[PDB]
Design a protein around this ligand. Structure first.
Ligand SMILES: [Cl-]
Length: 127
């Protein structure tokens, strides 16, 4: 599915992302916009043989297992296929692990380049 902006903000808040590990909700909504354009089924292949999966573009080298990535570590202990559900539970639960690993939201390239440093609370305004 393709979420609306406020629709995803409300779902992300129900799943505990607002202020999680120091990151207000607007960070997570901005990240999803620029990572996946709010589509739970987005996928993107990378030069190292990994693929990024779902609404938050979670990577198959470090975080989820897709069975075809060399050097897999599966640190979220989840098949990547579950991250293409229209229900965001599995993606959120893995995102919480990623953002707790010691480098904040810098795991999300689109967030680092296109959200960080902007007024991210604009992404929840009006919701
Ligand atoms: Cl998979």
């Amino acid at each position: 599915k393709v979420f609306g902006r406020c629709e995803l903000a409300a779902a992300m808040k129900r799943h505990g992302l607002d202020n999680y590990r120091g990151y207000s909700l607007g960070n997570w909504v901005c990240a999803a916009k620029f990572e996946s354009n709010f589509n739970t089924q987005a996928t993107n292949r990378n030069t190292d043989g990994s693929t990024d999966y779902g609404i938050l573009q979670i990577n198959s080298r470090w975080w989820c297992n897709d069975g075809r990535t060399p050097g897999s570590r599966n640190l979220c202990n989840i098949p990547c296929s579950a991250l293409l559900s229209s229900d965001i539970t599995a993606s959120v639960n893995c995102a919480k692990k990623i953002v707790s690993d010691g480098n904040g939201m810098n795991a999300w390239v689109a967030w680092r380049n296109r959200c960080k440093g902007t007024d991210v609370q604009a992404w929840i305004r009006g919701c």
